[PDB]
Amino acid sequence: SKFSFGQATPRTLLGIIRLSQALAKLRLADMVDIDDVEEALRLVRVSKESLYQ
């Protein structure tokens, strides 16, 4: 109830790998460094969670 959406189904994982792999490309990368992935998580959590304001 409230909070959610669950369940964070694997498409969110694959999604965040894919976002990661996107952010890498603006670094032009091939490395795909940790700050990239972390950043993807950031965008994800910031997306929602604005419903607490």
Binding site: S1, F5, T9
Partner: protein
């Protein structure tokens, strides 16, 4: 074709994403398997390739986002699609 086929390999954009009724939502629900639409009707057996990206602007259930309601209540959309 139009829309999805017309714009593919590139971004497709949708407004009023709630009012689209039903048959449309099935198309879009399927296109996230990418690489597909399948038209079995009448003179068409083809399965064409849509490489489309989708951006969808939608309004929460009327009037605006009632906080006394849980999320997924004020979002009218099924969980099959949001995943």
């Amino acid at each position: 074709g139009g829309a999805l086929v017309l714009a593919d390999n590139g971004i497709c954009c949708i407004d009023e994403f709630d009012k689209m009724d039903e048959s449309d939502r099935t198309a879009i629900h399927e296109v996230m398997e990418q690489q597909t639409i399948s038209i079995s009707k009448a003179g068409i057996n083809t399965t064409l390739n849509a490489r489309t990206s989708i951006l969808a602007a939608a309004n929460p259930l009327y009037g605006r986002y009632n906080p006394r309601l849980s999320p997924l209540d004020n979002i009218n959309l099924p969980a099959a699609l949001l995943s």
